[PDB]
Design a protein around this ligand. Structure first.
Ligand SMILES: COC(=O)[C@@H](C)CO[C@@H]1O[C@H](CO)[C@@H](O)[C@H](O)[C@H]1NC(C)=O
Length: 512
């Protein structure tokens, strides 16, 4: 695809991907690059840094404030009052001022902008956090935290209970808890009233309380999370913790009857001798239609349709794609048509894996389900490719250096036989070193380096009262933490569907 051809295509991740391929091969001239950012669907990351090597972006300073950015720390007292307050939006700018000017500016702004006054006088002390905390200036607290994660201080009950009302709180709590940073902040957060938090924040505060062995406080947080979570899967995760802590058998019963299929509801069903959940059976009689399952642009276009279709238009699409060759699109449509209440666990292109042993089949299928929902031309925001979502670098290493496939191109990852074959090859590498499918999943998504570093810690996946469940909440990258839980559930299901059942209790035992 020439850049001219691509510019005819609708903006999409597939068009971004192929523009990116031209950039990395140095095929986009400075002239081609002029109008190019209007042709880019997601102007973030590698494509943006590659385009900017060709055409740096001067943008952007709001022309209303342009003159404000002609002052420096040395001339800010010459600026009019509007420019002074605009430049004081930056804590680095405040930090660069000399202390005499911070005092002057603090008086200037005490009436109309006491938030600025607080930060200015705070930076005249040796610990701006301590000054802002004594003022209980909540906006200033989060500005300081965003400026530097190194500040750490005990926070009293009044202060910590004000923090959750600020939009920054959820990410703040999540980061310091799963990174095990800012221990004085973490310990202080034990005194947040569960009434003042909800959803993810309540849940992480439960995890925090567990790490300090405050199990009653943890129960109260997890109960509040269970009551407020929007998604049933997260609600189940919180009810599982209520059960593990206080052992109320009504909680476990509720978990076992969940409509969400996840590791917690699966485990509760196992503990209560409840039958395995119902898995839909999709077997279209019609063998084909006209859709090219190997055209990445066609997928982007039909995906946008499906995602924007009303309840009625899904019906037309479901019928059109109810074929064997478009089985992955069919199940994709059904999963939205049925408002996510039915469990679809398809096994498309099964000939390519039927000769692997059942357990390997399930791991491959479990990864593919989470990575792509089996869409052959799937492309992630980071241009991971195909059913198994291989990054181009690893795809080329395997296909060119290891397997020496003639005329290999990274787009071969869009071919199911290649995706499954490379997936098996890489999963062999990972499983040989890590054994557990959960650890393999973490390493597949996050790399074996991060996984080895996690598993080397004294406080991860070792023996313990609430292990291995607690460790699974403390996996230090959110994407991998979530990914492992989902792939593990898929793995259990596929092993069941393949007549090679394993109890998830055995899986959890082998994590320790
Ligand atoms: C947008 O969401 C989807 O289409 C779902 C299939 C989930 O997306 C997948 O999420 C994984 C991490 O959990 C990434 O590793 C995958 O690359 C990523 N696939 C894609 C195609 O973006």
């Amino acid at each position: 695809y020439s850049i001219e051809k691509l510019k005819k295509e609708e903006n999409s991740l597939a068009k971004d991907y192929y523009i990116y391929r031209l950039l990395e091969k140095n095929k986009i001239s400075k002239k081609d690059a002029q109008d190019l950012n209007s042709h880019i669907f997601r102007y973030i990351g590698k494509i943006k840094s590659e385009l900017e090597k060709i055409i740096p972006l001067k943008p952007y300073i709001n022309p209303k404030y342009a003159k404000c950015y002609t002052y420096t720390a040395n001339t800010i007292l010459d600026a009019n009052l509007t420019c002074q307050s605009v430049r004081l939006n930056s804590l680095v700018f405040i930090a660069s001022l000399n202390s005499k000017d911070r005092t002057t500016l603090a008086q200037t702004f005490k009436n109309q902008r006491p938030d600025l006054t607080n930060l200015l006088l705070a930076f005249n002390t040796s610990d701006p956090m301590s000054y802002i905390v004594q003022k209980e200036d909540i906006n200033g607290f989060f500005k300081l935290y965003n400026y530097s994660k190194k500040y750490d201080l005990d926070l009293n009950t009044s202060l910590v209970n004000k923090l959750p009302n600020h939009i920054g709180f959820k990410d703040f709590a999540q980061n310091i808890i799963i990174k095990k940073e800012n221990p004085k902040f973490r310990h202080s957060m034990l005194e947040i009233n569960p009434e003042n938090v909800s959803e993810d924040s309540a849940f992480y505060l439960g995890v925090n309380a567990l790490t300090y062995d405050k199990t009653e406080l943890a129960y109260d947080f997890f109960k509040k999370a269970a009551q407020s979570f929007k998604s049933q899967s997260n609600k189940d995760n919180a009810i599982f913790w209520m059960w593990l802590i206080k052992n109320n058998e009504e909680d476990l019963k509720t978990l076992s009857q969940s409509s969400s299929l996840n590791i917690y509801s699966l485990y509760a069903k196992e503990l209560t001798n409840t039958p395995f959940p119902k898995i839909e059976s999709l077997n279209p009689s019609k063998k084909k239609n006209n859709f090219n399952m190997q055209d990445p642009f066609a997928w982007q276009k039909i995906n946008k349709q499906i995602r924007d279709a009303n309840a009625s238009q899904l019906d037309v699409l479901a019928k059109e794609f109810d074929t064997q060759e478009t089985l992955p699109i069919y199940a994709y449509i059904l999963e939205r048509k049925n408002n996510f209440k039915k469990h679809y666990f398809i096994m498309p292109y099964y000939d390519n894996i039927k000769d692997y042993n059942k357990t390997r089949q399930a791991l491959i299928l479990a990864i593919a389900r989470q990575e792509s929902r089996f869409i052959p031309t799937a492309i992630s925001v980071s241009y991971a490719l195909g059913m198994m979502q291989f990054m181009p670098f690893l795809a080329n290493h395997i296909g060119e250096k290891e397997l020496k496939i003639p005329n290999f191109d990274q787009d071969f990852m869009f071919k199911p036989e290649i995706a499954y074959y490379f997936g098996n090859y890489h999963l062999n590498y990972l499983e040989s070193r890590l054994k557990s499918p959960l650890f393999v999943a973490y390493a597949y998504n996050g790399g074996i380096g991060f996984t080895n570093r996690m598993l080397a810690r004294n406080d991860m996946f070792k023996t313990g009262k609430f292990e291995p469940f607690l460790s699974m909440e403390l996996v230090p990258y959110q994407e991998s933490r979530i990914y492992g839980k989902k792939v593990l559930a898929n793995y259990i299901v596929y092993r069941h569907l393949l007549n090679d059942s394993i109890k998830i209790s055995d899986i959890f035992e082998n994590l320790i």
